[PDB]
């Protein structure tokens, strides 16, 4: 249930998400591409899903990858801005869920993003505490897949 | 090209875009739904394209329409944030262009959004000057369609 998952976002979790987002969200282009490139390096078996982006090994130099990456960060910004209202968070999460259900992405594969996020957070000095907080948010999307 | 269209947005245009967005973008749920509902009211022929959203006449009550509307406002937020870097604005614009090209939305049809935006701006007292500024931004997307 996406509703039960959304309920797991307690006061403490929401604070950690906001505090860390102030930092990671300050450079959407750079951190977005870093998240994506890490995903492709750590789980090479997912590259096949992104054929539309072309050669993702080019990183920041790939225009399609950069556009996709920046937009991905705005999806996260969207989630963070809906933390105050469970009903609105749910409706936006289900919106992006569809975008992935159409690409045949399961909850298990969607979860492969936790690794990259934890690595990007660690590079900015945010440890496991924040990684776990973000994992709970990703869990809300997984519940809708 | 899309670059020429984007590279043409002047300082005065960007200023009016940012000033009006500070207001219109402050309530993404309320103004986003207002935009979508206005589009359906004035251009009833577009209703069929949004069958995935269900009964759009339900407005705010429709969770799918609400999720779509809030998300659309973040697409505009994305554009606004990339105004000072034409290279970044272009790659995000082309990304959203693909989303509509896949739905067979022509440049002319995409332009139907100008009416709704003009009316929403007007509801907050932003006149023709501001409406013209937004049509210039919508034109950057049309250059990609
Ligand atoms: C925090 C986690 C993630 C977020 C918020 C997210 C967000 C997005 C967004 C906003 C889009 C564009 C939707 C569209 O225009 O159709 C997208 C596309 C996509 N996502 Fe994700 N995504 C996430 C994780 C993943 C993961 C882990 C995978 C694969 C294992 C995945 C696979 C895809 C694919 C295949 C596309 C289509 C790319 C294209 O052809 O343009 N996503 N995602
Ligand atoms: C200010 C201009 C507009 C913006 C910023 C915008 C933005 C968006 C975004 C973010 C999506 C979701 C893409 C996805 O996840 O697949 C979307 C979907 C869509 N848009 Fe637009 N759009 C605009 C104008 C229009 C207009 C005027 C039309 C109709 C003539 C149109 C037709 C569609 C359709 C049919 C969908 C698919 C909806 C669905 O089934 O989920 N858009 N738009």
Curated annotation (Swiss-Prot), chains A, B:
Family recorded in the similarity comment: Belongs to the globin family.
Keyword Membrane carried by entry: no
Keyword annotations: Cytoplasm, Heme, Iron, Metal-binding, Oxygen transport, Transport
Organism name: Anadara inaequivalvis (Inequivalve ark)
Name of the molecule in the record: Globin-1
Quaternary state and interactors: Homodimer.
A GO MF label: heme binding
A single Gene Ontology CC term: cytoplasm
Chief location: cytoplasm
PANTHER family: BLR2807 PROTEIN (PTHR46458), GEO09476P1 (PTHR46458:SF1)
Binding positions (heme b): 100
Domain Globin intervals: 8-145
Keyword Protein biosynthesis: no
UniProt subcellular location: Cytoplasm
InterPro entries to which the protein is assigned, alphabetical: Globin, Globin-like_OT, Globin-like_sf, Globin/Proto, Mb-like_M
């Amino acid at each position: 249930s996406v509703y039960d998952a959304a309920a797991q976002l307690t006061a403490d979790v929401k604070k950690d998400l906001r505090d860390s987002w102030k930092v990671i969200g300050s450079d959407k282009k750079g951190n977005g591409v870093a998240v994506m490139t890490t995903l492709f390096a750590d789980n090479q078996e997912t590259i096949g899903y992104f054929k539309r982006l072309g050669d993702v090994s080019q990183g920041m130099a790939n225009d399609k990858l950069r556009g996709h990456s920046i937009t991905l960060m705005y999806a996260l910004q969207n989630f963070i801005d809906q933390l105050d209202n469970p009903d609105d968070l749910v409706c936006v999460v289900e919106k992006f869920a569809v975008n992935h259900i159409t690409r045949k992405i399961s909850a298990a594969e969607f979860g492969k993003i936790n690794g990259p996020i934890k690595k990007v957070l660690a590079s900015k000095n945010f440890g496991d505490k924040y990684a776990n907080a973000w994992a709970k948010l990703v869990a809300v999307v997984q519940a809708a897949l």
